[PDB]
Structure 1
Amino acid sequence: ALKAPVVVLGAGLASVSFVAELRQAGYQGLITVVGDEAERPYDRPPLSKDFMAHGDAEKIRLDCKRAPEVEWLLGVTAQSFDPQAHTVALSDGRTLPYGTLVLATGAAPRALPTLQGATMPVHTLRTLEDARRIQAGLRPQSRLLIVGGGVIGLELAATARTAGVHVSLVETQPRLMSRAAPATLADFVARYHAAQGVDLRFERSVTGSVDGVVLLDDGTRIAADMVVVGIGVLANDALARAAGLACDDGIFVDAYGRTTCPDVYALGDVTRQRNPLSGRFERIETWSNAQNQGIAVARHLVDPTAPGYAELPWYWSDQGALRIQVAGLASGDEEIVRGEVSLDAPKFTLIELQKGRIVGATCVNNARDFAPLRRLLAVGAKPDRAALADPATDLRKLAAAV
């Protein structure tokens, strides 16, 4: 039961998306939103794109326009809350009372401890401070070493290239994007990346540095004028474990965003929820989730006959010449291919199935397939195998019809 006052900790995409559904669903009680960053809440995905380019923080601004008569407290940290007093201590000395408390504190990046004391600069990229900072480090005749081959290593590599930097990349796995991409796509994309001016080093390790030169485990030397660490993000659930809620690198929540603690909710990167596709409680590190879990949770708070979050996971990545969309599971017992898998005209889709049922699907420069495959996903459909591989088949009339 939603009771005023409503207090949200974190002013990111989940916060913002969350309180707009509060009001723009008819809740005009008191709301306060706390964030430890000082600046209007800003979209994060454009940082890996546009921002290194025309470095405008003013077009990537989360526009909290749909949240009237909200109280923002930016540049203010939440140190702790008391579930038994129903208050939150902030950094500026103030006490926030609450009937309902929402943790939407996201995740932080797990920097390099081996690049602990590097004479060269290094940044973990997660904000509009770090953003501005790498970007402005991206000069034409220069070096840059990225550590990690996931989406941030790849996305930032790409523009580093467009920058004019000779980019090389350390990867600890034998593949890129192990966390959530079909292997085909991963193997595609790396081949995409080689053919552009990016120097890939799979299976390797950063054992340390020397003066101005990198140190892979194989004693390898790398002259880098700037380094970037995108080894992944850990949940910031610190205030959560502190107060006794259920946490395992992330805060557990059920279908309405409930925690194990009465009057406390949780959304976005910080949380661990069911993947209906797997059945396992995973943290889901997607914009997609950030927003829609946001909405689904604030509307159930305002309308309890309404369902809890049910949507299926999906995300994007826009690295170089590749507008990629990935939905549901990365893994199936069978894979189906459509289109032309070329590093110069790539325009295709992958479909992943499991005993007939679609468990997932990607799209590279083929948006028109995405929506219809996602809806097929959503009802766990097992369509006709041969039709799915028949390029005369349009997946919209298939998705739409039966």
Structure 2
Amino acid sequence: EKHFKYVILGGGVAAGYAAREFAKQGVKPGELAIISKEAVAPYERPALSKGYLFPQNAARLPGFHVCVGSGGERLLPEWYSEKGIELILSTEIVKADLASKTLTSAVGATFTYEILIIATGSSVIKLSDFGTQGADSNNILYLREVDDADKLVAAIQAKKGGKAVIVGGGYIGLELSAALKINDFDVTMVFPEPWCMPRLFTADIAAFYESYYTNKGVKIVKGTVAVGFDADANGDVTAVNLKNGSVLEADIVVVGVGGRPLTTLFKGQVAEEKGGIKTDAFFETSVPGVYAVGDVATFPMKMYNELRRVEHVDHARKSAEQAVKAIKGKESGESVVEYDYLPYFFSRSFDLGWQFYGDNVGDTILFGDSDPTSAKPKFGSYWIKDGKVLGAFLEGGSPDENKAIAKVAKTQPPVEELKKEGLQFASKI
């Protein structure tokens, strides 16, 4: 049995950034452990669908450990022991007793905390969860964690010049379709929605990304779903059967059909809401000295006066810091400012990349060009509700331009021929 004042449960983005803030706020050797089922120190998960997958000059660990991702220092394993932070790796926690402030591994081992941070992130939805016929075949791969990414790199090696099917039109599908395409696959994307990223992209924005993908050789199948997979004698996938009756041959299938907060260790013991562990503006759960951060938290969103959950890296980094800042700033009394999150989301693929700040509500306008034959494409969109601008999106922006639209989203300036001098409106705020 081991005892620590501070236990982080999860070896991910929030955990790494929590650790860095622990060290900034003067934590003393032996006081803090991070417990993780992964076999490596925390890292910048976004790299797994991008740089990790390049055919040359690829991100590899220890390169992308936190906090490089945001311009910070790179925390390698030796950083942690050097500071007496305990990296407890290859360790799945299967039982969590908030009552005893006690955690039990899979090996039966036992761990106590005074102060717990919950950063167990999100699961991957698998087609096997649904009982889909043949979803258990080989080379049907998911991508959450670096071992998944190493399995994806090996199948890419073994199957080059073959056929890839990407099941899903969210973030994963977008990036993984591009990455497979860059690694010399014939790629088809499959998804049921009217157009990709429908939770963020308008019809206009989606049509751009769809033409560009089409122009790059990616085939897109919409309005349907994978209802099953054929396999060969060895059990390797050979095709994807669709609900519309077509069959798509395949050597690799990559599925990105969403994620859920990894909260099962705590069902009952903590107030939940919108799928996540409910928290206040400091990331403390219903249970005193128990914190929840990153993808798992539902927390108050001051600036839209609402409870929200978000599944995004910027937020994992900051909520981790917030919680650490709220712990130490009650240890020594004083006071801490509440979390004030400006939503910030982004993605990159091929030569493209975009940013979104704010809330995607009310009516939209596009601006800039816009043309799928480049170059380099530079357009955006403003979301206007109640006269004010509420959200903005920008593809191919410079840093000045990106600070600009962020400043707009934060300030919510009012109104209207915005479509003439559109990017320009953001710079005059």
Is the TM-score greater than 0.5? yes
What's the secondary structure of 1:269's corresponding residue?
A: helix
What's the secondary structure of 2:188's corresponding residue?
A: strand
Query: Contact 1:240–1:247 (CA<8 Å) still a contact in 2?
Result: no
Q: In the superposition, relative to structure 1, how do residues 95 and 119 fare at CA in structure 2: closer, same or farther (>3 Å)?
A: closer
Instruction: Answer yes or no: is 1:309 the counterpart of 2:339.
Output: yes
Query: Contact 1:297–1:309 (CA<8 Å) still a contact in 2?
Result: no
Which of 103, 106, 116 is the matching residue for 1:101? 116
Query: Contact 1:268–1:294 (CA<8 Å) still a contact in 2?
Result: yes
Aligned to 2:369: 340
Which of 169, 185, 200 is the matching residue for 2:205? 185
Instruction: Answer yes or no: is 1:61 the counterpart of 2:65.
Output: yes
Aligned to 1:46: 47
Structure 1 unmatched runs, 5+: none
- Segment of structure 1 superposing worse, 52-61 or 165-174: 52-61
Q: In the superposition, relative to structure 1, how do residues 82 and 180 fare at CA in structure 2: closer, same or farther (>3 Å)?
A: same
Q: Deviations over 1:251-279 (max 9, x none)?
A: 11110001112221000012222344544
Q: In the superposition, relative to structure 1, how do residues 340 and 242 fare at CA in structure 2: closer, same or farther (>3 Å)?
A: same
| Separation in structure 2 between the aligned mates of residue 387 and residue 203 of structure 1, nearest angstrom | 34
Aligned to 1:130: 148
Give the TM-score of the pair, scaled to structure 2: 0.86
Aligned to 2:139: 121
Instruction: Answer yes or no: is 1:221 the counterpart of 2:222.
Output: no
| Separation in structure 2 between the aligned mates of residue 334 and residue 161 of structure 1, nearest angstrom | 31
How far is the alpha carbon of 1:5 from its aligned partner? 0.4
What's the secondary structure of 2:326's corresponding residue?
A: helix
- Number of residue-to-residue matches in the alignment: 393
Aligned to 1:14: 14
Aligned to 2:309: 283
- Segment of structure 1 superposing worse, 291-300 or 230-239: 291-300
Superposition RMSD in Å:
2.2
Instruction: Answer yes or no: is 1:373 the counterpart of 2:405.
Output: yes
- Segment of structure 1 superposing worse, 17-26 or 122-131: 17-26
| Separation in structure 2 between the aligned mates of residue 72 and residue 242 of structure 1, nearest angstrom | 29
Query: Contact 2:380–2:423 (CA<8 Å) still a contact in 1?
Result: no
Structure 2 unmatched runs, 5+: 67-73, 232-237
How far is the alpha carbon of 1:131 from its aligned partner? 1.0
What's the secondary structure of 1:167's corresponding residue?
A: strand
Query: Contact 2:116–2:289 (CA<8 Å) still a contact in 1?
Result: yes
Instruction: Answer yes or no: is 1:272 the counterpart of 2:298.
Output: yes
| Separation in structure 1 between the aligned mates of residue 423 and residue 100 of structure 2, nearest angstrom | 63
How far is the alpha carbon of 1:118 from its aligned partner? 4.9
Matching residue's letter, 1:353: I
What's the secondary structure of 1:360's corresponding residue?
A: strand
Q: In the superposition, relative to structure 1, how do residues 235 and 296 fare at CA in structure 2: closer, same or farther (>3 Å)?
A: same
| Separation in structure 2 between the aligned mates of residue 284 and residue 18 of structure 1, nearest angstrom | 18
Aligned to 1:362: 393
Which of 256, 262, 269 is the matching residue for 2:288? 262
Q: In the superposition, relative to structure 1, how do residues 308 and 210 fare at CA in structure 2: closer, same or farther (>3 Å)?
A: same
Matching residue's letter, 1:41: P
Q: In the superposition, relative to structure 1, how do residues 292 and 169 fare at CA in structure 2: closer, same or farther (>3 Å)?
A: same
Which of 80, 87, 111 is the matching residue for 2:126? 111
| Separation in structure 2 between the aligned mates of residue 108 and residue 60 of structure 1, nearest angstrom | 21
Give the TM-score of the pair, scaled to structure 1: 0.91
How far is the alpha carbon of 1:61 from its aligned partner? 2.3
Matching residue's letter, 2:293: L
Matches within 5 A, 1:145-294: 145-211=165-231, 212-241=238-267, 243-246=269-272, 248-276=274-302, 278-294=304-320
Query: Contact 1:35–1:77 (CA<8 Å) still a contact in 2?
Result: yes
Matching residue's letter, 1:36: K
Matching residue's letter, 2:153: Q
Query: Contact 2:93–2:105 (CA<8 Å) still a contact in 1?
Result: yes
Matching residue's letter, 1:14: A
Query: Contact 1:268–1:290 (CA<8 Å) still a contact in 2?
Result: yes
Q: Deviations over 1:143-173 (max 9, x none)?
A: 0111100111010101211111111011111
Query: Contact 1:120–1:225 (CA<8 Å) still a contact in 2?
Result: no
Matching residue's letter, 1:58: P
What's the secondary structure of 1:393's corresponding residue?
A: helix
